[PDB]
Amino acid sequence: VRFLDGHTPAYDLTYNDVFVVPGRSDVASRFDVDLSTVDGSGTTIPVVVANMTAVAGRRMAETVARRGGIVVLPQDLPITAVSETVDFVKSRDLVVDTPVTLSPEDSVSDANALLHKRAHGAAVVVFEGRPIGLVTEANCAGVDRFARVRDIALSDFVTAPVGTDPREVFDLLEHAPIDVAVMTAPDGTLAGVLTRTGAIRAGIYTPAVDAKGRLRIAAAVGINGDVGAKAQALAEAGADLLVIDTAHGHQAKMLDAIKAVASLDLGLPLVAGNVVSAEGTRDLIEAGASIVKVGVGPGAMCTTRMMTGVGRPQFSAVVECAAAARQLGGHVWADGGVRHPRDVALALAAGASNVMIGSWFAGTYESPGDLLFDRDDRPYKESYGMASKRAVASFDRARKGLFEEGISTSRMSLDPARGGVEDLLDHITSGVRSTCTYVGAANLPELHEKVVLGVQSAAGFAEGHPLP
Amino acid sequence: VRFLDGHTPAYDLTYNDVFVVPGRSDVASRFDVDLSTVDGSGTTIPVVVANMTAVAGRRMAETVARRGGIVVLPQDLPITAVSETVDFVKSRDLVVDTPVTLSPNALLHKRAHGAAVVVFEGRPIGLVTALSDFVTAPVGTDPREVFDLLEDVAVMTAPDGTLAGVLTRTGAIRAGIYTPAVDAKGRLRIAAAVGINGDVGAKAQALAEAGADLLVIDTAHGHQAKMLDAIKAVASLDLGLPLVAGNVVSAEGTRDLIEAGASIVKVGVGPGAMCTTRMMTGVGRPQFSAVVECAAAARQLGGHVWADGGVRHPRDVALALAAGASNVMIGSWFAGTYESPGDLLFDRDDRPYKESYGMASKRAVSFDRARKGLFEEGISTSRMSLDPARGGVEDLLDHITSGVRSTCTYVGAANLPELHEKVVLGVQSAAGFAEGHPLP
Amino acid sequence: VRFLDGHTPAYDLTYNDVFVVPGRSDVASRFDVDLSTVDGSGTTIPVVVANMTAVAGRRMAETVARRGGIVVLPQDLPITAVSETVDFVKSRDLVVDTPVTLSPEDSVSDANALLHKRAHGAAVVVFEGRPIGLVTEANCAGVDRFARVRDIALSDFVTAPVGTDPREVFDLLEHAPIDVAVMTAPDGTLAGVLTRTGAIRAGIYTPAVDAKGRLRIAAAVGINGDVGAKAQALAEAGADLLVIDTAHGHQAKMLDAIKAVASLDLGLPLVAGNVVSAEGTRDLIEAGASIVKVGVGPGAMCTTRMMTGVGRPQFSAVVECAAAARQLGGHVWADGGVRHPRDVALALAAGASNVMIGSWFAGTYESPGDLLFDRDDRPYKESYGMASKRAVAARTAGDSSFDRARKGLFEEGISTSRMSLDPARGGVEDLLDHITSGVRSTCTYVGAANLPELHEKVVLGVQSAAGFAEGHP
Amino acid sequence: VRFLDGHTPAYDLTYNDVFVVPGRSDVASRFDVDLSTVDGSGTTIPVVVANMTAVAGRRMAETVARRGGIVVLPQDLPITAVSETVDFVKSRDLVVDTPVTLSPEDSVSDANALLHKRAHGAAVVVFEGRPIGLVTEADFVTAPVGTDPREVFDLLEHAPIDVAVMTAPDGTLAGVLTRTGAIRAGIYTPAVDAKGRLRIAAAVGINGDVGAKAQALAEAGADLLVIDTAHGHQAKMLDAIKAVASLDLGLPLVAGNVVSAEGTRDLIEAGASIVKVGVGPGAMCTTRMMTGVGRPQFSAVVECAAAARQLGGHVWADGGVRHPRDVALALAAGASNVMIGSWFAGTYESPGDLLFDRDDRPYKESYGMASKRAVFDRARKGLFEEGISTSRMSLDPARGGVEDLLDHITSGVRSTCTYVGAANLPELHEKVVLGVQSAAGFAEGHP
Numbered sequence A: 001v002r003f004l005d006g007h008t009p010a011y012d013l014t015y016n017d018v019f020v021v022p023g024r025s026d027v028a029s030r031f032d033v034d035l036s037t038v039d040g041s042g043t044t045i046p047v048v049v050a051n052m053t054a055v056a057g058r059r060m061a062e063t064v065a066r067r068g069g070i071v072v073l074p075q076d077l078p079i080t081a082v083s084e085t086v087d088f089v090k091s092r093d094l095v096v097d098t099p100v101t102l103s104p105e106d107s108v109s110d111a112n113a114l115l116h117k118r119a120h121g122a123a124v125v126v127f128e129g130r131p132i133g134l135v136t137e138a139n140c141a142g143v144d145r146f147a148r149v150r151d152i153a154l155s156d157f158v159t160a161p162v163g164t165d166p167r168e169v170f171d172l173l174e175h176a177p178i179d180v181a182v183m184t185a186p187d188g189t190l191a192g193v194l195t196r197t198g199a200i201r202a203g204i205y206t207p208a209v210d211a212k213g214r215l216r217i218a219a220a221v222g223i224n225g226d227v228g229a230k231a232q233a234l235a236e237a238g239a240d241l242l243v244i245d246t247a248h249g250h251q252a253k254m255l256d257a258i259k260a261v262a263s264l265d266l267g268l269p270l271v272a273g274n275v276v277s278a279e280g281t282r283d284l285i286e287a288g289a290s291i292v293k294v295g296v297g298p299g300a301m302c303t304t305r306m307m308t309g310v311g312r313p314q315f316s317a318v319v320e321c322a323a324a325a326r327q328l329g330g331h332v333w334a335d336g337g338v339r340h341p342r343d344v345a346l347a348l349a350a351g352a353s354n355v356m357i358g359s360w361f362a363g364t365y366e367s368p369g370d371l372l373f374d375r376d377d378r379p380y381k382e383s384y385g386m387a388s389k390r391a392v393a394s395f396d397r398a399r400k401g402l403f404e405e406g407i408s409t410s411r412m413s414l415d416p417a418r419g420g421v422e423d424l425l426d427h428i429t430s431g432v433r434s435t436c437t438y439v440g441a442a443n444l445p446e447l448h449e450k451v452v453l454g455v456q457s458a459a460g461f462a463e464g465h466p467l468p
Numbered sequence B: 001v002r003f004l005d006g007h008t009p010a011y012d013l014t015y016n017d018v019f020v021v022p023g024r025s026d027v028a029s030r031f032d033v034d035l036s037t038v039d040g041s042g043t044t045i046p047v048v049v050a051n052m053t054a055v056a057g058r059r060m061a062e063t064v065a066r067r068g069g070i071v072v073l074p075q076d077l078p079i080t081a082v083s084e085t086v087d088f089v090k091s092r093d094l095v096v097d098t099p100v101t102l103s104p105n106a107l108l109h110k111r112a113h114g115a116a117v118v119v120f121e122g123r124p125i126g127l128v129t130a131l132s133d134f135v136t137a138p139v140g141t142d143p144r145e146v147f148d149l150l151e152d153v154a155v156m157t158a159p160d161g162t163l164a165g166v167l168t169r170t171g172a173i174r175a176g177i178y179t180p181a182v183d184a185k186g187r188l189r190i191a192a193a194v195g196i197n198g199d200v201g202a203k204a205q206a207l208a209e210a211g212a213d214l215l216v217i218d219t220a221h222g223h224q225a226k227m228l229d230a231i232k233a234v235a236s237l238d239l240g241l242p243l244v245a246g247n248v249v250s251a252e253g254t255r256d257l258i259e260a261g262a263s264i265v266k267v268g269v270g271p272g273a274m275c276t277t278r279m280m281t282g283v284g285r286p287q288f289s290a291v292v293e294c295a296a297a298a299r300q301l302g303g304h305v306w307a308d309g310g311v312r313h314p315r316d317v318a319l320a321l322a323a324g325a326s327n328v329m330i331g332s333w334f335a336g337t338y339e340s341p342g343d344l345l346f347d348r349d350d351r352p353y354k355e356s357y358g359m360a361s362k363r364a365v366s367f368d369r370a371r372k373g374l375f376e377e378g379i380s381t382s383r384m385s386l387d388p389a390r391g392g393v394e395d396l397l398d399h400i401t402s403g404v405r406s407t408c409t410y411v412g413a414a415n416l417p418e419l420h421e422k423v424v425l426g427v428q429s430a431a432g433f434a435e436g437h438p439l440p
Numbered sequence C: 001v002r003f004l005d006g007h008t009p010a011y012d013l014t015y016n017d018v019f020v021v022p023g024r025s026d027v028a029s030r031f032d033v034d035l036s037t038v039d040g041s042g043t044t045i046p047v048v049v050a051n052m053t054a055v056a057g058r059r060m061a062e063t064v065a066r067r068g069g070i071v072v073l074p075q076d077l078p079i080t081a082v083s084e085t086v087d088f089v090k091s092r093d094l095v096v097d098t099p100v101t102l103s104p105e106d107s108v109s110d111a112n113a114l115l116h117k118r119a120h121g122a123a124v125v126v127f128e129g130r131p132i133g134l135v136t137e138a139n140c141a142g143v144d145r146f147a148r149v150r151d152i153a154l155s156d157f158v159t160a161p162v163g164t165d166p167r168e169v170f171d172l173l174e175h176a177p178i179d180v181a182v183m184t185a186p187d188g189t190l191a192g193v194l195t196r197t198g199a200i201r202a203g204i205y206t207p208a209v210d211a212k213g214r215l216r217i218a219a220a221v222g223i224n225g226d227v228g229a230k231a232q233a234l235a236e237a238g239a240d241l242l243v244i245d246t247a248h249g250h251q252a253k254m255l256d257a258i259k260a261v262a263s264l265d266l267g268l269p270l271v272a273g274n275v276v277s278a279e280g281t282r283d284l285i286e287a288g289a290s291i292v293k294v295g296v297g298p299g300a301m302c303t304t305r306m307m308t309g310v311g312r313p314q315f316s317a318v319v320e321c322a323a324a325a326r327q328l329g330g331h332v333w334a335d336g337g338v339r340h341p342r343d344v345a346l347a348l349a350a351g352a353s354n355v356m357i358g359s360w361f362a363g364t365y366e367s368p369g370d371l372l373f374d375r376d377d378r379p380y381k382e383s384y385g386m387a388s389k390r391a392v393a394a395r396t397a398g399d400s401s402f403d404r405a406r407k408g409l410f411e412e413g414i415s416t417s418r419m420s421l422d423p424a425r426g427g428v429e430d431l432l433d434h435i436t437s438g439v440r441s442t443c444t445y446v447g448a449a450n451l452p453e454l455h456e457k458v459v460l461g462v463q464s465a466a467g468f469a470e471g472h473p
Numbered sequence D: 001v002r003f004l005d006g007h008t009p010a011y012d013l014t015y016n017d018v019f020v021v022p023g024r025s026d027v028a029s030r031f032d033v034d035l036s037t038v039d040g041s042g043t044t045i046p047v048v049v050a051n052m053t054a055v056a057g058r059r060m061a062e063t064v065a066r067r068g069g070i071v072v073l074p075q076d077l078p079i080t081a082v083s084e085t086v087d088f089v090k091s092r093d094l095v096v097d098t099p100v101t102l103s104p105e106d107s108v109s110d111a112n113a114l115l116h117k118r119a120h121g122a123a124v125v126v127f128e129g130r131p132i133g134l135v136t137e138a139d140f141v142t143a144p145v146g147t148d149p150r151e152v153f154d155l156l157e158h159a160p161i162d163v164a165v166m167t168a169p170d171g172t173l174a175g176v177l178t179r180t181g182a183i184r185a186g187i188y189t190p191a192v193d194a195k196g197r198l199r200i201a202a203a204v205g206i207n208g209d210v211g212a213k214a215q216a217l218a219e220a221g222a223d224l225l226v227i228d229t230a231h232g233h234q235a236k237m238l239d240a241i242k243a244v245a246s247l248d249l250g251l252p253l254v255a256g257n258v259v260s261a262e263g264t265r266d267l268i269e270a271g272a273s274i275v276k277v278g279v280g281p282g283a284m285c286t287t288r289m290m291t292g293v294g295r296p297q298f299s300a301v302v303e304c305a306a307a308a309r310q311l312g313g314h315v316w317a318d319g320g321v322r323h324p325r326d327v328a329l330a331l332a333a334g335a336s337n338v339m340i341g342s343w344f345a346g347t348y349e350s351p352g353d354l355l356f357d358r359d360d361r362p363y364k365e366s367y368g369m370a371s372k373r374a375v376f377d378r379a380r381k382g383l384f385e386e387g388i389s390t391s392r393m394s395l396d397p398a399r400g401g402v403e404d405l406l407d408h409i410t411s412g413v414r415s416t417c418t419y420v421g422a423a424n425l426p427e428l429h430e431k432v433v434l435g436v437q438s439a440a441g442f443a444e445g446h447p
């Protein structure tokens, strides 16, 4: 990483304190840029969904992995539900997406609430595995909530065999009144659905898959209790990647945790803790971790800096840690504090292999949390921090709970036009691809190497138009 | 103190300009760190309440000291009063708390207790938030037993049947978290303050008789002739009590005050709370830079430094201790509590708050009464907001202590002296401080 | 009923336009008043839950019936659901209340939402049919919403055999950590739940029960299609009372419906249509209806007045309709426009045998509508009008999609309103406590020992302008 | 009472539904009017403070009693509390008021909070009884106790401060007298008991044993007994009145609440000299929204006053008093006195603690008596308990004391008498002409 001549700040740098300078560019198009990651995570786009209960569900795992990202399941989640989630995800189709399925005896109230858990804007009425019709949000408006799918379903829908060409079903949905096409297995059961926009993304994004060509999914583990036994179970569960997570990454308990999991020789890539320094970055990798997660305080749910005063500007933290991981033959995850696509690109420019996106994605449809509204009828979802699950560890529950970090809350409002998380992946990946062409990079490794950066003042960040 | 490479600033640093960098730590939890102070104040937690009248009352002195802090009492208080408040505070129970009570809301909000006891000749006739329908318990009861029995108010009774006090749910919890700050006799610690005007020897000597466990000789400008002579006067009597002195932001002044016989040096000028001096004078200095310099200067002579002024957040408390301060003094943030002398008022939004007032001229140096009175520093005021749920100071003490304890685990210190020794700090930009979630 | 001398207004009266004048009373307390009804509804208190999808569920049915009220199931509800609802309600205990069930593997998100489906404020965790833990409203706070119930539910709770006297469970709960008392059958299975207030109400309210001692429940029918077959089907489905309902009750299609149902001899009480006039009350009773439901326009979800201009002030409507019904030996249900207990008492003082309550009860926990939270995050629920289900249509059988859309254009749309829960006490039983407390007082103010005496002994007067503004909201 | 010719409405009338028609008057000034009450209550002005925990304290009872009003202490208060409250009121001077006590060691903020407990706007800093000075709003003027308020008035004119610290002959203070406080001494005449000091009343419920409670209250110093219940026409009231009267306590007996002449007769024939009148107009009364039972207060006072006077009785107008017009209209309706509710809770002397508003204007909290006005064992009756209603009455930013409201009230009534030509309240009732108005009629003028 290099800075413009004359720029050597007297302070550590945030994402807002820096900018990228366009260099000479031989790259013709944005689609000529390969966004695939070299860190062994398997992500074809530089996006990792943070491990948070308010963020990473089974639905988020499906939709993101199909678009090339990866979703880390939250820690302290029962092994039975972990194994059930990963089986759900790895059973998903790579092109078509799993819709919200309904039964004809369900209430329109339930139908309307379940519709918003996915970005399709329509639900499929099913009998046994086999679609009998479609329910649209427009048809649920103005009707009786407790009338059960009486006259709702149109029963006439454009349908195509599973594994058809996304460009043909794209054409099939051109003259169709509804934008959803149901896709069926050769036996007649429902394979899934594909939106006209979904067919487009299939040609753009490369799904993140295992050797079987099954959607990738990861899971997180705390350093409390027996870490080796816990990590062993999640490995057998089919988790493609393991994340050892705690608030303070540089610690005695953390290093012993990596050694405990690595002593089992699970052959899985190990992500380790949170450290903003090179010395911590060096110790975690030496402990047997392949990748290190980096930050303290940038998280939107993180009150650490206002409480403890501990923390560090994320850009400088990523820059320093990526340097330490590179020399030790490893990689760095930029973790927390990504509001805008700029923060993603700047993190990669800092040398991070992958960026971990938090509560920003809690404001989508596929988010596990329930969709709420305002008096203004503006859609939003409430995001929460992982809280105690990120820390180290009846009368005791109230006492220790007194000094313990309280779970933080913030309102993430949905985009009233496009609320799906894939739409956010459009904004993120489009921005980064332009960052690559501005610098002239054909891929991520070239980006970090060729990038020229500079520092700005407060008036510098105010330049330009704020996004929607 | 250690700084990052290239982080030597072109400006002086406030609490907002800096951050603490994590390091290798063998300390697992917040309960494994010792918050006790080595400055000889007697506090089990590094928190001192300011000598403003708008903050430190009898209720404030009782509440904080019980949780391990200490409250220095305002100057311009008749010694008859400081004696009774000391007598009041030192007569308190270390576990049970004194309820607000009157003969058969503004009074109910004077304490963090959810209820008030109605009393007749010492014996409770029951509660206002109803005779035998609430829970009682004799004094000497373990807090865990009171906690269990409340599964949020439990009236504690003296063996004769009268009212000894009250213990709430969190109050029962907190008996086993905080170690009370007590003198040799096991009574809650309390301190007093004096101006440098008039006779300081007799004032200080008289306060030592009033039961003050610590003496504060306080003035607006710490570095000057009248202060040095004043410290010399107090130390000459050799009362044996800890001496903190004045306010100075310079390394030399910190030493000058110590050489005069003061053990501790209060440090800061102008960030303040009710202080208009920066906008009035322009005199002052960023608090972190000030403390870091003064703390280092005192440690060389074996002295200690109280970080004084400009503490909004638990962040500022940890940073001051990391700056080398043995204790921190919090003026205004505790005016925003229940235990503050000012009653509870509300405003436009349903959120509560309290009005804080400044010392001003009281920290400074019939024709002369009006003429010198015209230049009095006017009506310092501001709005400190309560936490809409928990308005008690002990809840702010939870925050403060929870943060600092966690700071130590981050740096890897097992105590406060190790915090300053093991800490690495760096400078941040505007957007740097904006990182993370704010506090409620 | 008679009015104070000099009061003969030139306009018809609403609930806000009138007041009850106190009179000499030998009645000491409100508890000595008999709230039982003479209309044959079987209700021990003068409240009927309106037939609307936003108010009357399976939970509203048992909760109100246990306290002596009755719930009318909405018309055009699938009979499969009615029979399912009837069987559920009539299988409920007269004392013990049906609790909210959770699993050890359930999410706190699911736990907290299901928790508000009842007024218990607590939810029982079950293992193999046998209760283990208990989840409280307060017990979910500051916890990860997706955490399991194992580390949540507290297994220390008071217990007691099913069929225990309500007075004992009350004293058992005084020293208890939690307000709820879990009821267990001797075999160990979960019988149900009884709260402290639930124990108190057992000594106050007397359940409305059928011939076999099972909680009473009603059902409604529109006059479109085959009414005889629908009514016959609901009667065999276990409905203890039948309600024939439409917007305009004074029209021939309604008259034929009553005659059709009454010709089947179900041996059940008949409520018929909605009429604001004395002539309508007679004609419906002369059509074979035992009871006459009364109002046009006072309904909270009703747009009739703003659309058509048709309607009548509810008080003046009830006083006239009740009087005409008594002469025919029938009874009148006051239907629509009840904001306050005042409207319930005035309706009875007007001569109504029973008071039908709508969207007000949609603002409770037991309401079938899902619980929502606003800006201030205070609890509320949405109420909806029955719309076209209350209207009359021609035969739509074998229609055209054009005709289906044609008739749908002028069709009445569903109106909506936000009904706020009381943040402290959000159950419908708390409104029943509110309503019955007010009506019982009116009886003592008038000096009536029961509802029939109230109508007889009541003196009324008219007010205007500042008259309504007196008192506190 | 005779309404204007042609006015015979189809409804009963509230205070806002009526207006007084002026008539020929030989009455020159307001001070020539006699506001005295003929009901034998002992009030020199037609003002009775309602019995509620939100309004009548010991401080409220002192302040209005020296201005001629009377306080009815809320019922179901401990006999230990009423005695101490009475002992306080009976310990008060007739002329000079009681100051707010301070001390050199107290704070600036606490001094201001304690200051609002009185309308003095000033507090006396005292040392072991000896006043050392004063604090005024944002040294002292001293005069001996029982001086001429007209002389003290003059001393305060030459003073920078408007309050006078009154020093007892041996040293130290009996109390304080303001300029306005000295003026009112020439206006208002204190209501006194048989012992020559401030008069006070007490309320009792009809539940339990009334006679024993009334006996206890009477020996506890209550000069007037009030038998109070939501519905006064019930039989348990007849028992209550006849019970208390049989004790021969020699005190004025006011009873219950009735809006009807039939109720007024029965209670009077039961031995009640005065009948308190209303159902529902009360600011804290939710009865009308709950029960539906009630009646417009003006029509209630009209019919009941006529029935009472026929039996040689009297009528207290109870509830619905907002503006001074309501007081005058009640007396014009034939009431011997007017009972004032939560309106006074919006003063300084109210026991309710003072809060601050969004606009940073003073307001106080008022609350209802609820079940105390009504007719395991506690829990069953506690579930049907009528919730205590809550309303917020805002103080006048300028004059926040209750004496200031008394100035308003007594000014309006004295002015009402001059319009009709009455020299007193009995003449007010006989000489008054009334009329009916619409919503637009009441909206005329400056609120």
Ligand SMILES: Nc1nc2c(ncn2[C@@H]2O[C@H](COP(=O)(O)O)[C@@H](O)[C@H]2O)c(=O)[nH]1
Residues within 6 Å of the ligand: A050, A051, A052, A247, A274, A298, A299, A300, A301, A302, A303, A304, A335, A336, A337, A338, A356, A357, A358, A359, A360, A384, A385, A386, A387, A388, A390, A405, A407, A408
């Ligand atoms: N200290 C703390 N960090 C959190 C908490 N919740 C999430 N985080 C961190 O913040 C990251 C995402 O933050 P975001 O991208 O929403 O700003 C997570 O991957 C995790 O490292 C929390 O409750 N406390």
Ligand SMILES: Nc1nc2c(ncn2[C@@H]2O[C@H](COP(=O)(O)O)[C@@H](O)[C@H]2O)c(=O)[nH]1
Residues within 6 Å of the ligand: B050, B051, B052, B220, B269, B270, B271, B272, B273, B274, B275, B276, B277, B308, B309, B310, B311, B312, B329, B330, B331, B332, B333, B358, B359, B360, B361, B363, B380
């Ligand atoms: N400079 C100055 N400092 C003051 C004044 N009044 C109080 N202080 C000091 O302000 C400190 C509190 O500041 P805080 O820590 O609340 O920001 C106390 O230690 C107190 O001595 C003042 O008027 N001027």
Ligand SMILES: Nc1nc2c(ncn2[C@@H]2O[C@H](COP(=O)(O)O)[C@@H](O)[C@H]2O)c(=O)[nH]1
Residues within 6 Å of the ligand: C050, C051, C052, C247, C274, C295, C297, C298, C299, C300, C301, C302, C303, C304, C335, C336, C337, C338, C356, C357, C358, C359, C360, C384, C385, C386, C387, C388, C390, C414, C415
């Ligand atoms: N016109 C009309 N009246 C309705 C509708 N829904 C309910 N109602 C009437 O309103 C009554 C309930 O009114 P509520 O008690 O909620 O104010 C019902 O019993 C019925 O008489 C509707 O959709 N349209």
Ligand SMILES: Nc1nc2c(ncn2[C@@H]2O[C@H](COP(=O)(O)O)[C@@H](O)[C@H]2O)c(=O)[nH]1
Residues within 6 Å of the ligand: D050, D051, D052, D230, D281, D282, D283, D284, D285, D286, D287, D318, D319, D320, D321, D322, D339, D340, D341, D342, D343, D367, D368, D369, D370, D371, D373, D389
């Ligand atoms: N029913 C009832 N009446 C009340 C209550 N509180 C006060 N009142 C009545 O209302 C009167 C107050 O009148 P106002 O506040 O309108 O001037 C009281 O004197 C009393 O008669 C209450 O809580 N319930």
